[PDB]
Scaffold this motif. Sequence first.
Motif, PDB file in Angstrom:
ATOM      1  N   UNK A  75       0.858  -1.203   0.000  1.00  0.00           N
ATOM      2  CA  UNK A  75       0.000   0.000   0.000  1.00  0.00           C
ATOM      3  C   UNK A  75       0.896   1.258   0.000  1.00  0.00           C
ATOM      4  N   UNK A  76       1.877   1.282   0.908  1.00  0.00           N
ATOM      5  CA  UNK A  76       2.998   2.228   1.019  1.00  0.00           C
ATOM      6  C   UNK A  76       4.245   1.477   1.547  1.00  0.00           C
ATOM      7  N   UNK A  77       5.420   2.115   1.618  1.00  0.00           N
ATOM      8  CA  UNK A  77       6.646   1.422   2.066  1.00  0.00           C
ATOM      9  C   UNK A  77       6.613   0.969   3.549  1.00  0.00           C
ATOM     10  N   UNK A  78       5.646   1.457   4.345  1.00  0.00           N
ATOM     11  CA  UNK A  78       5.380   1.028   5.729  1.00  0.00           C
ATOM     12  C   UNK A  78       3.911   0.581   5.948  1.00  0.00           C
ATOM     13  N   UNK A  79       3.182   0.176   4.894  1.00  0.00           N
ATOM     14  CA  UNK A  79       1.772  -0.249   4.969  1.00  0.00           C
ATOM     15  C   UNK A  79       1.455  -1.241   3.838  1.00  0.00           C
TER      16      UNK A  79
END
Length: 139
Positions: free
Chosen positions: A46-50
């Motif tokens: 989803x993102x680099x931490x999600x």
Amino acid sequence: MRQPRIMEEKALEVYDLIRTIRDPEKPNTLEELEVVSESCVEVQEINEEEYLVIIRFTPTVPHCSLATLIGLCLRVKLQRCLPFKHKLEIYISEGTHSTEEDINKQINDKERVAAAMENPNLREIVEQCVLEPDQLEHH
């Protein structure tokens, strides 16, 4: 343009997290009962931490009393045991000709997942199911 990122080793780790869960009645694991395999699991960024986690399984019986509790064990194991912001999505297709749509709601809706964890009997079964067997070589 380039191809997008694929979370293939995260899907291998997510599979191995659920692989050793036990059935609501049987002492053997979801892999031994043939409930799951590598192709049952997928993961996306989803993102680099999600990240998004997806599982599409087939239960041991087409009955809500086990089918809900297997998909709850899938959700509950990964949502507690994974690091960082992993968003879970759990799906199922077995039932009568309708039940399957409610089982999808019971195993994947946050308030239904919370209600199943507030309930003492369902919680106590799920805790015993999500904790893996050590050896158990008694016979």
